[PDB]
C-alpha cells in the first residue's frame, strides 16, 4: 500500500534499474482534510494536512534521504554525514543503518529536540555536538565531507530535493489538481524549493492546471528570508527551524516569486496556538516548527488574504512525538490521586 | 481520495450507513522486509516488520480506536474513557479531538512514557493519574463508565478487537497469504486476540491459505500468561506492557492453543538487545515493548524452535519516539566540542 517512494515515482526520478534502493517504505503519507478553522470554514476555504509526521523517522526528510543514500550507495559510498537541527540527522541515521553504512551527524549543542536525539542515538549514528548553532554545524559538516570519504546528505545534495519534490506529486495525485495555496515552514529552505519544483514539473506534464501559491513561514526570531538578510543569532522554541542562513536561500525566493506566494514570520506564541489547535481540535499532533504552517494560515486568514472557496494544503513537517518537552507549554499534567472510583471521578470532573 | 480504515474493510466490520466515520487515515502501514538477522537468513527464514508505529498517534491502537470511537458517536456518546499505559490513551485523546467529544484517560502515575504523556496533554484529554498500576486503572475506569455517561474505549469494548484485527488482513493482502509465524507483544492481550481473529477470518474466506502460529511475548517481570496466574506487581522498562492481569486472557490463550503457538517471556535485557538491533541494524525505531516481539524471535531462533524455510511477520506495535528516555539505555550522547572541523573530526572518531 505504501511502496518505496523511489519505486512509486521511478518515472520522475534520476534512478535506473541498477540504483540500489535503500528504503524504509517512506512517502505516500495521509492528506488529512481538516475540519476548520472556523474562520476558513465559513469562507469556503478547505484545508488539508499533508502529515509528513508519518514517514518512517517522523518527518518529511525521509523523501529526500531515501534518494540521497540510495544514490550515494550507488556511488560506492560507505558513510554519509549531515548537519542538523534534528530531523535530517535522524533520517540519515536510520537510512544509513538500513543501507548498512556509517552515519555522522553534527548537531547544535542544546538545540535539538529530545525525540530527535533519541533517534540518532538508538540508530547507532556517530553524533558530534558542536558549540554553535545549525549554521555553524552546516559549514563544519561540509568540510568534514571534504576531509573524509563521506557523502554529504544535507539539502545541498541535489538528490535530497529531488526526493522531496515527490510530496507535491502526491498532493496532486490525490486531489486531482494542485491546491490554490500550499503552506509550509521554512528552515534551511530545501523543502519549499522542492515543493515548487514538484508543482512546476506536474504542471509542465499537464497533470495540474493551476500552479499553487507557496506560503512559507518562519519563526520571528529566525526569519532571515523575511528580513532580507542572514540572522546571526536565530532564536525560537521551534528549534527545527532555528536557522539564520538558509542554504537554499535563492531556491525559496524564486519559489516565492514564481508562484506569487509569500514568506512571512509568525511569533512563537502564534506557533504554540496553532500547535494546540491542531492536536486539540483536529486530532493531529505535529512538532512546533510544523505548526508554523498552520500559524501562517491563521495569519493570512486573520488579515483576509485568502480567497473564498479556495483549497489550502499544509505540509505538517514533523510528528509531535519529536518534541515532547513543548507539550508542557500548552497544558499541565495533573498530580496523582488515590486509586478510588470516587477520587478518579472527581479528578475527571464528573462529580 | 484515500479511504479511512473502516472503509478499506467495511464489509468485515460492525459498521453500516448509519456509522459516522471518525478517522485520521490510520492503517495501511508499511510491511518492511528485514535483512536478517544472520540466524534467520542462514536457516532460510525471512522476516517482515508490520510497522504500526506509523499510524497517526504512533501505535497499533489507532486501528481499534477508530472503530471504537465511531461506534461510540453513532450511539450518541458525548465522552470516552480508558485506562492506559500510554498508547490507548494517546489514541483515545486524538480520536476524541477528531470527533469533537471529551476524552478521559486514567494513567498509572510514573509508568507512562513521556512521549505518550505529551500526546494526552497536547490533545487535550482530561488526564487522571492514579497511584496504582494499569490493572488498577482499568478496574477503576470500567467502574467509572458503568457509573457515568461515558463510553469505555478500552479493549474490553469488542469494537477495539474488530478494528485491530485488520492488521492481519493487511499482512495477508500484501504477502498474498499468511506467514508461517506471526510474533507480537502481549500486554492486555487484545492485539494477539484480534490477530487470530483476523487470520481465522481470511482463512475461512479463502484469502488466507494457511494459519500463522501466533507467537506472543511478555516481559519477564510482567508475564502472567507465561506464569499461568496474574502478576500482582508487574515490572519492566517496557512500560507499555507492564500489565499483570490481561483482560483478554482467554482470547490470548485460545489464540495460542488454536494456532499451535506460544506465549513466552523475554527479559528486559533481551528486549533492549532486540530494540537496538532493529534500529541500528534494520533502520526501524520501535519502542521497547514492540521489540519484545523481535526478542521472542531471537529466542526461538537460538532455541532452534523456528522451522527453516519459513516466513515470520512481526508487529512492531509502537514508534521509538514514544519512549525517548530508553535511548540512553543503549547508547550515550557525547559531550559538546568547539565549532572547529579539527575538533569535530576528533569527536567523530575519524582520527
Ligand atoms: C519538522 C521540521 N519542519 C520544517 C523544517 C524546515 O524545512 P526546510 O526549509 O526544507 O529546511 C525542518 C528542518 C530540519 C532541518 O533542517 C534539519 O533537521 O537539519 C524540520 O525538522
Ligand atoms: C507499544 C505497545 N505494544 C504492545 C502493547 C500490548 O498489546 P495488547 O496485548 O493488545 O494490550 C501495548 C499496549 C498498550 C496498552 O494496553 C495501553 O496503552 O493501555 C503497547 O502500547
From TrEMBL, chains A, B:
Pathway membership, UniProt: Amino-acid biosynthesis; L-threonine biosynthesis; L-threonine from L-aspartate: step 5/5
Reaction catalysis annotation: O-phospho-L-homoserine + H2O = L-threonine + phosphate
Cofactor(s) essential for the protein: pyridoxal 5'-phosphate
BP term (GO), one: L-threonine catabolic process
Origin species: Thermus thermophilus (strain ATCC 27634 / DSM 579 / HB8)
EC number: 4.2.3.1
Organism domain of life: Bacteria
Keywords: Amino-acid biosynthesis, Lyase, Pyridoxal phosphate, Threonine biosynthesis
Coiled-coil stretches noted in the UniProt entry, renumbered to this chain: none
Residues in the signal sequence: none
Residue intervals of the Rhodanese domain: 82-123
SUPFAM superfamilies, per database record: Tryptophan synthase beta subunit-like PLP-dependent enzymes
Function, in words: Catalyzes the gamma-elimination of phosphate from L-phosphohomoserine and the beta-addition of water to produce L-threonine.
Record carries keyword Transcription regulation: no
Protein name: Threonine synthase
Keyword Protein biosynthesis: no
Modification sites for N6-(pyridoxal phosphate)lysine: 61
Family named by the database record: Belongs to the threonine synthase family.
Amino acid at each position: 500500500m505504501r511502496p518505496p517512494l523511489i519505486e512509486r515515482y521511478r518515472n520522475l526520478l534520476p534512478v535506473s534499474e541498477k540504483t540500489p534502493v535503500i528504503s524504509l517504505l517512506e512517502g505516500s503519507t495521509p492528506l488529512i482534510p481538516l475540519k476548520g478553522p472556523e474562520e476558513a470554514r465559513k469562507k469556503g476555504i478547505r484545508l488539508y494536512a499533508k502529515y509528513e509526521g508519518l514517514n518512517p523517522t517522523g518527518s518529511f526528510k525521509d523523501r529526500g534521504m531515501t534518494l540521497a543514500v540510495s544514490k550515494a550507495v550507488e556511488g560506492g559510498a560507505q558513510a554519509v554525514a549531515c548537519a542538523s537541527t534534528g530531523n535530517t540527522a535522524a533520517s540519515a541515521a536510520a537510512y544509513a543503518a538500513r543501507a548498512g553504512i556509517l552515519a555522522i551527524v553534527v548537531l547544535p549543542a542544546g538545540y535539538v529536540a529530545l525525540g530527535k536525539v533519541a533517534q540518532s542515538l538508538v540508530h547507532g549514528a556517530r553524533i558530534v555536538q558542536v558549540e554553535g548553532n545549525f549554521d555553524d554545524a552546516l559549514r563544519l559538516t561540509q568540510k568534514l565531507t571534504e576531509a573524509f570519504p563521506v557523502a554529504l546528505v544535507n539539502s545541498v545534495n541535489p538528490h535530497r530535493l529531488e526526493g522531496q519534490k515527490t510530496l507535491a506529486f502526491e498532493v496532486v495525485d490525490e486531489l486531482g489538481d494542485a491546491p490554490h495555496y500550499h503552506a509550509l515552514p521554512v528552515g534551511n529552505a530545501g523543502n519549499i524549493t522542492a515543493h515548487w519544483m514538484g508543482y512546476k514539473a506536474y504542471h509542465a506534464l499537464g497533470k495540474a492546471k493551476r500552479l499553487p501559491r507557496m506560503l512559507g513561514f518562519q519563526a520571528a526570531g529566525a526569519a532571515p528570508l523575511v528580513l532580507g538578510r542572514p540572522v546571526e543569532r536565530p532564536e525560537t522554541l521551534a528549534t527545527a527551524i532555528r536557522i539564520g542562513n538558509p542554504a537554499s536561500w535563492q531556491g525559496a525566493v524564486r519559489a516565492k516569486e514564481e508562484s506569487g506566494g509569500v514568506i512571512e514570520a509568525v511569533t512563537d506564541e502564534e506557533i504554540l496556538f496553532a500547535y494546540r489547535y491542531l492536536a486539540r481540535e483536529e486530532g493531529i499532533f505535529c512538532e512546533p516548527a510544523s505548526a508554523a504552517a498552520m500559524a501562517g494560515v491563521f495569519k493570512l486568514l486573520r488579515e483576509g488574504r485568502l480567497e473564498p472557496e479556495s483549497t489550502v494544503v499544509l505540509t505538517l513537517t514533523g510528528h509531535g512525538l519529536k518534541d515532547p518537552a513543548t507539550a508542557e507549554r500548552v497544558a499541565e499534567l495533573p498530580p496523582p490521586v488515590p486509586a478510588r472510583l470516587e477520587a478518579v471521578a472527581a479528578a475527571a470532573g464528573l462529580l
